[PDB]
Design a protein around this ligand. Sequence first.
Ligand code: OYT
Ligand code: CL
Ligand code: CL
Length: 149
Amino acid sequence: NLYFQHMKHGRVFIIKSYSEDDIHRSIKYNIWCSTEHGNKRLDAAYRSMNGKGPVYLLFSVNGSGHFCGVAEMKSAVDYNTCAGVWSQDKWKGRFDVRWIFVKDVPNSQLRHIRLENNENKPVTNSRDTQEVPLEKAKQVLKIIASYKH
Ligand SMILES: CNc1ncnc2c1ncn2C1CC1
Ligand SMILES: [Cl-]
Ligand SMILES: [Cl-]
């Protein structure tokens, strides 16, 4: 499997959700919204990528012990949208996503991948919109895709 070799235009972020309901809504309607500073990071990455490669999102519910799937950013952030569509009313705005994997991957499968841009911490100890260096992101995606147990 060498699909990901020679991929240079791609950026990958961790998405954390306190709410399982928000995960289910995102899957159903292919939309997401982050914090203000999270939206700004994702919007900048999406817009500067300019359709040259994907912005992937690695989703995990806080405290759950596993990742729950992978989606791709499919639009810029619209900051002025209906309020209160998520579990909490904190989030302002909306962007499109396309879910790629919906599958539980235990943190045990991924905790040995460490992020040089986050103090060598395990990728499983990231906060919302932590960016993942491309070479580590490829390793995470291969583990998520190949997981079956
Ligand atoms: C609809 N978006 C969201 N829903 C629930 N929690 C969120 C979130 N975006 C960031 N967080 C927290 C850091 C976990
Ligand atoms: Cl809306
Ligand atoms: Cl977080």
